Amino acid sequence: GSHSMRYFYTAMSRPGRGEPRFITVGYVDDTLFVRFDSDATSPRKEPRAPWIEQEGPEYWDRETQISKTNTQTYRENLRTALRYYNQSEAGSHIIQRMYGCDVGPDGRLLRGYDQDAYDGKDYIALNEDLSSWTAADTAAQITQRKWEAARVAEQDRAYLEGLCVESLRRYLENGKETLQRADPPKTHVTHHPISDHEVTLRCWALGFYPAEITLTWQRDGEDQTQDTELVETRPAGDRTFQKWAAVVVPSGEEQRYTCHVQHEGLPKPLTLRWEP
């Protein structure tokens, strides 16, 4: 199947409470595999998946050094954003980074990313071409010009086409038991009267991996987007995810409703109903 590796940085200033906290997490698909936190007792890159534990001590020192250097860079980035936005030194601010690569079934690069946000808004983003940038505003344009002058996009491209895909390839093989196993959802429909003539049908999906799923209710074969309550897909804590979709239906009309489930772990989309 297709796979992704992503690193996410969060750098959070906190005037009066020390230097900005820097957290890195890395993911292959929906599996966290490494973390770094500048607030840890002895900040290091730490394994969070068993298949990464075999990487040698040189891997850990190199990765730790990278995060320590990036802690400094993103702290500097926070000071810089204050200037570019004419902001005071009193308020707390956040810069976030996401970068990484998507690969197809053959393991070749499908798409690379390197983008940042400031206080939850788009700041700058490497375009799909891995050669040019999109700046969200005139502040980010200053960063763009600096990155164009320094040929940052070329450096990103070399990483994204090289180490990013190569390391993700090694991780997929090392973690093939789990990273390359899809767990299909366990499904069921529950029935609960709201009142004399209204019932809630709730379509459940449990125990699935990866997180991506589609759950829809139809009434006489037509989609009920507006009338369906759909919760955000949520982590169970054992690597798997959960989701449900609910519809309120007239009593007596339960059999007009079908729940539809698509997931990578299912050979074909499922159709289920309330089964008294």
Partner: peptide, 9 residues
């Protein structure tokens, strides 16, 4: 594996 270094704004 991460890239060699991040970049200054």
């Amino acid at each position: 594996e991460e890239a060699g270094r991040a970049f200054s704004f």
